[PDB]
DNA sequence: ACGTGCATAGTCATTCATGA
DNA sequence: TCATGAATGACTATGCACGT
């Protein structure tokens, strides 16, 4: 029996802890915004085919999938993160295609994994987009059977773009959601000017990222919490849902609450209120009753007595119930396998930088590719321009080696263009399939010219970027929710 | 008459409505938590209250009464519908008029139906008399066309007819996604559930009528009973027609 | 709003859930003994390639891929029917090779989906034999998007093997587990004495299937049940332990059970014993003391009193425990989609009208590959009489069209023959390649043949059920466990 | 001598030897665990209590919370002792406390949350050596025809290969080397000869020796102060390979 | 009254950091 | 004290037929 000291044990154990959770668990990747259980889930649905280009699939073979394969941990948790990908209220740009019951943005849970289908959204398609062009490294799995990429393409900020919030060991992260189009100005402005210092690339991405932008709608009040948090990675940005102020013919008037802050759940919010009208907090109120709909949506109405004024009440809600609450802003992600917390000018170049990098390593993957194809093309034709020669000797020979070694001989060819001459069809020793060859490889070259020309140029490497993601925005880029307003 | 709705004494899966009058409210008895959850949330809430039961219903024919009353699912039907059971029964103290059974189109939603419609028959039975009871018809199918708004089908046959007039009025399905086809309540989204079976002027309801009390009886304690033996001929019996029942 | 009677909607109603649950839920089919849910388990785990010569997969991918494409119910008791084909105590033949925690014969449950992996055994790959060379009529799934298996090939009689146990509406079945040896010599002898009536086969089958054969060992008592179960379709065969008196140095006696009576719970099993001499129903009992482990096995000892015989006590337990219990054997399953109580040569014929239903579709579904392949062939070996001819003529084709349209009439060839043609590499043109679409042309052309033969002359079918089952029950065929006494 | 159940937990399965001196409480993480456990161990002298879910900080949370927690109650009625000043060594049921939890970070998490437990409510137990922490296995190694080998390691793993192919053994790259990711994976005979079997199992005994120190580290890591923490990870995390060089 | 096996998931308690 | 979000599943109750 080995003795061990306590505290070499308990530091040891500890520290050992922390850190997995802290770079592998409940904070985000700063490249694609993704923890590992969401990299997971989406890389998992994308193997399986789960795409928008076929029906959902049950959300338990999702699930199965994501955890035989990838993710070493229990079905239930796993499921409850998918179902989060899916729902409009969490995510600003939802990754997941949820059919079914997947709740609301109150009490209302998801209904079980067997009553669920899901796919991934077109946006999520984006995320994975040419990951198989070598464009990002992949490792081996929790038991070496099969490889996982350890970041995706991620064709757009998603970190960003969706937020993320997470508790660690040590520290915690909380990145607000923000409008796709206004993200992409401040990239577009990034690749322009990639030579801009810190001081001044954070002035244009802050005056192109005019703020969070929350799936919830509802308003930001103030502009102070905003510009902290981009310029020290902390800041209270505060949030408010709208009051309507209704006045019913000769009757007393209601206010109508048709939106509310991010992550305010709808029935704990009726609930709070109706509890400090008991005891009597929010005197005015006269009664409470909730016209939601799934037609009309949130639709909360508050008469207050005659012997009120809307405005006092709509404060004292403010003051006492989450009408108004802050979002406090902690701007942590890991880069490089390392916790940070970052401008905002910081999270949008990093990003841009695994853009480029994702081109450059496409281009180079194709670039190989072409050159192969190529390579096996040149030999096609010298088989072409000999064709007379190249069937009578396959003819004399008593192996495909005899006849593969000849025609080495014949055309001046590797072993692997001979091998591609063997295993070439009848189909295309017709006329246009014959001058289809010869077409192909004037194609190739050109494309091989092309993507020389890509990597020789930053220049147009910052260009793919742009019209790529331009593309991306154009299609689905939407409205900003959240409005912006001033003390 | 009027009776207060449960707002922040009544079960605690009840999802109430807002109107005090039962001639106006109607409580949707659903099969499962998942297709109550939604119900909850695809409902007209001022009309309509949701009283999700879980699992099978206990047989109220076979199980002795003090056992029955132990239910919790059970309870929670006697304690939503106001009224008492059996002789201490008083239909003016009924909080809603319509009392709707929505289970799956599946074989176990058939089976729900049966030992509810035997709760009711035996414990409340003027429930049914009066025709406050009815019956909700699932959609089977989802017809979801490229350009158009989408149909929906309650049957193999509406199916086939609706497939064959949308193509043949030049509309179009994708052949991947296409029809789904839907296997319980529990698959459906409250969008789904409101604009197939509880929105008044599309839902597809089935009235419960009770003519020959004595027969029904006879047939309540025939399938339901404790007598296996007169189940078992019943069933080997008569299941050779059931086909031909409408004919 | 229609109208609709109470007693049409019960009588619709609950005939609907009683046919289903007979025959598409609760009940076994007799050719292959399979529950749906078993059948669609097994058919998953195969089709998603979850065999033998691969790795345990983790079975929450074998329950998520049998709830989306063929059994739709929840995951929950999809896996505890899957988790049940693993156990070595419930099945005398298990089907599912499992790894990890799948539960004790006492209290102690399984462990979750999530911990446990599982494959299918060797002798569920007999079940699934050659099932993709249309030996089974196959079916839509529940939402038409793939196919699955009506019927199992079942290359061995799993109903009789395995046994079954069910309640469905109005009945119930419960068909014990045989040895599969003496399961073979019944069949054995059913397949040479294919002409004998009911009467003889009865006798003949009788005297070769002892008994059941349960997987927890234990004793049968008498042979009256027995017999009732195989001429009736039911019967009760006692059961029992077996009990060894153990002697101690002080010189007091003690029992030692090792062995229980087929489904019977170890921990309640012990417990209701301990209920019994508390209150005091089996006296002469000093203490009790599960000396049980992994190792030894099912080890409980029962130290009696000075003033106590073995036997009485030994007697006792027999009479108010489980120690000695019957079987209520009820052999009821589905034939032909239609209930039935099956004498044992009704169970043995039925499955050898399958076994030879499997051979000769088997043998027709390669009897028509093999003219397909025969046919296709013979159209190469024209191309090659006449290839300087075929080959000048493709090359003087404008098109593939203009190529294959003259290849017919080249060569007097069809169509899809002319496309064989075409798709020929240059590889095939060589002198040994040329050889060997000859000889592979006489090579089929003799299993025609054979195959011909077969389907000509029963006898050759049913000698291959016989030499392809005795196979199997060489290889995977055990000794008898529970012993047969008389009284 | 003690009377075991055949007053205490209804989780904990006891064992059989009435002697807290032979007995051993392997405390394990998991139903699924402890359900193998249950049936691998040695009844005789091995008795089971499984431990569900992440274990309450006593370091964070408040005094009355902590007695209120269904986990730590049921360690605490079944190691016999008290807690705190009511503690009696003399009323230990067992004298071998094993800790068992997964070679994964939520296993050495829980084993913090324990050994926790263990230093503020109940110390004795570790100062004489009575705490003990079970090392599962890594790897399995499935050979084609001799007996299969366990490796607690990576390195030990590749060893064990190297070995045996060069002895000639021969192992399927398909099954081949079986690894575990928690002790739930593992049946009844896989934790028996791994941890269990006393005569084969990888225990190592918590002993304390600055206990000054060690109430400091424990108030560090586990107390409520997050900036102390934060900066002791930062601080201490760069160098937590080279802690036994 | 209990076992059997295929059908019809929400509830329950902690770690962890932060701000009300 | 509560919400947040990924981490670490056993228990609870009916139908159904049958035999102790
Ligand atoms: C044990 C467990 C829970 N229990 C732990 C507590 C101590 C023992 C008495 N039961 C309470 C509640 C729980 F409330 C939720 C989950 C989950 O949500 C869950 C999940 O997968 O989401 C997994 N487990 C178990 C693995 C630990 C859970
Ligand atoms: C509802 C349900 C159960 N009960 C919980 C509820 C208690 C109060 C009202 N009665 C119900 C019944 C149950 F104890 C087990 C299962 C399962 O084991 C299970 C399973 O999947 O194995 C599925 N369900 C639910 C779908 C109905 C189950
Ligand atoms: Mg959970
Ligand atoms: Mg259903
Ligand atoms: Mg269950
Ligand atoms: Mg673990």
Redesign the interface.
């Known amino acids: 029996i080995e003795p061990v000291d306590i505290e070499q044990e308990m530091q040891r154990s500890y520290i050992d802890y922390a850190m997995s959770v802290i770079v592998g668990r409940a904070l985000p990747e700063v490249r694609d915004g993704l923890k590992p259980v969401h990299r997971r889930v989406l890389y998992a649905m994308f193997d399986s085919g789960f795409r928008p280009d076929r029906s959902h699939a049950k959300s338990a073979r999702s699930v199965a999938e994501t955890m035989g394969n990838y993710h070493p941990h229990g079905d239930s948790s796993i499921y409850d993160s998918l179902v989060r990908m899916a729902q409009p209220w969490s995510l600003r740009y939802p990754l997941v295609d949820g059919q079914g019951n997947f709740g609301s943005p109150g009490n209302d849970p998801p209904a079980a994994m067997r009553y669920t289908e899901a796919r991934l959204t077109p946006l999520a398609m984006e995320m994975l987009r040419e990951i198989d062009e070598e464009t990002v490294d992949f490792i081996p799995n929790y038991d070496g059977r099969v490889q996982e990429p350890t970041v995706l393409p991620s064709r757009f900020p998603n970190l960003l773009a969706n937020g993320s919030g997470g508790i660690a060991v040590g520290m915690a992260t909380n990145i607000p959601p923000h409008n796709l189009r206004e993200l992409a100005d401040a990239v577009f402005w990034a690749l322009e000017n990639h030579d801009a210092d810190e001081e001044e690339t954070l002035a244009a991405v802050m005056g192109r990222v005019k703020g969070p932008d929350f799936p919830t709608a509802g308003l930001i009040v103030g502009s102070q919490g905003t510009a902290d948090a981009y310029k020290t990675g902390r800041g209270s940005i505060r949030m408010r849902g709208v009051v309507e102020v209704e006045e019913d013919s000769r009757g007393r008037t209601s206010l109508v609450i048709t939106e509310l802050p991010y992550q305010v759940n709808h029935d704990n919010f009726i609930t709070s209120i109706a509890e400090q009208v008991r005891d009597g907090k929010l005197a005015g109120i006269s009664n409470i009753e909730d016209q939601s709909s799934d037609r009309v949506g949130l639709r909360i109405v508050i008469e207050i007595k005659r012997d009120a004024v809307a405005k006092v009440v709509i404060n004292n809600l403010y003051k006492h119930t989450q009408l108004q609450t802050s979002f406090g802003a902690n701007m942590l992600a890991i880069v490089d396998g390392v916790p940070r917390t970052l401008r905002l000018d910081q999270l949008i170049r990093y990003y841009v930088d695994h853009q480029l990098d994702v081109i450059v390593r496409r281009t180079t993957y194709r670039l190989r590719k072409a050159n192969e194809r190529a390579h096996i093309l040149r030999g096609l034709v010298k088989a072409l321009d000999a064709l007379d020669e190249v069937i009578a000797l396959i003819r004399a020979s008593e192996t495909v080696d005899i006849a593969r070694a000849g025609l080495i001989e014949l055309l001046d060819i590797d072993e692997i263009q001979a091998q591609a001459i063997l295993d070439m069809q009848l189909r295309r020793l017709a006329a246009l399939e014959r001058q289809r060859i010869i077409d192909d490889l004037a194609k190739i070259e050109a494309e091989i010219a092309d993507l020389e020309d890509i990597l020789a140029k930053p220049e147009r490497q910052r260009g793919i970027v742009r019209d790529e993601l331009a593309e991306i925005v154009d299609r689905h880029g939407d409205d900003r929710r959240t409005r912006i307003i001033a003390i | 008459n009027a009776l207060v709705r449960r707002?922040?004494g009544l079960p605690g899966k009840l999802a109430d409505c807002?109107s005090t009058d039962p001639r106006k409210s109607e409580l949707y008895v659903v099969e499962g938590?998942?297709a109550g959850?939604?119900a909850?949330?695809?409902?007209?809430?001022?009309f309509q209250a949701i009283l999700p039961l879980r699992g099978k219903i206990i047989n109220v024919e076979k199980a002795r009464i003090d056992r029955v009353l132990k239910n919790t699912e059970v309870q929670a039907i006697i304690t939503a519908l106001g009224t008492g059971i059996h002789d201490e029964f008083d239909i003016g103290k009924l909080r809603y008029h319509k009392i709707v059974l929505m289970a799956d189109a599946?074989?176990?939603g058939?089976?729900i139906?049966?030992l509810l419609?035997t709760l009711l028959?035996r414990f409340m039975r003027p429930l049914?008399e009066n025709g406050h009871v009815?019956?909700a018809q699932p959609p089977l199918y989802k017809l979801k066309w490229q350009r158009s708004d989408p149909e929906f089908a309650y049957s193999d046959r509406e199916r086939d007819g609706l497939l064959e007039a949308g193509l043949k009025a030049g509309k179009k399905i994708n052949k991947?996604?296409?029809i789904?086809?839907y296997?319980?309540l529990?698959?459906?989204?409250?969008?789904e559930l409101?604009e197939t079976t509880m929105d008044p002027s599309v839902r597809?309801?089935?009235?419960?009528?009770?003519?020959?009390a004595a027969?029904?009886d006879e047939?309540?304690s025939i399938?339901?009973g404790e007598d296996?033996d007169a189940?078992?001929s019943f069933?080997?019996r008569?299941?050779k027609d059931?086909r031909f029942?409408?004919v």
Chains 1, 3 share one sequence.
């Open positions: 707002k922040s807002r938590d998942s959850g939604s909850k949330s695809g409902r007209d809430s001022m599946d074989v176990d058939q089976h139906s049966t419609l028959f049914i009815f019956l991947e996604d296409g789904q086809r296997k319980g529990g698959e459906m989204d409250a969008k409101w597809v309801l089935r009235q419960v009528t009770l003519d020959d027969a029904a047939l309540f399938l339901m296996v189940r078992r069933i080997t008569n299941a059931v029942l409408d």
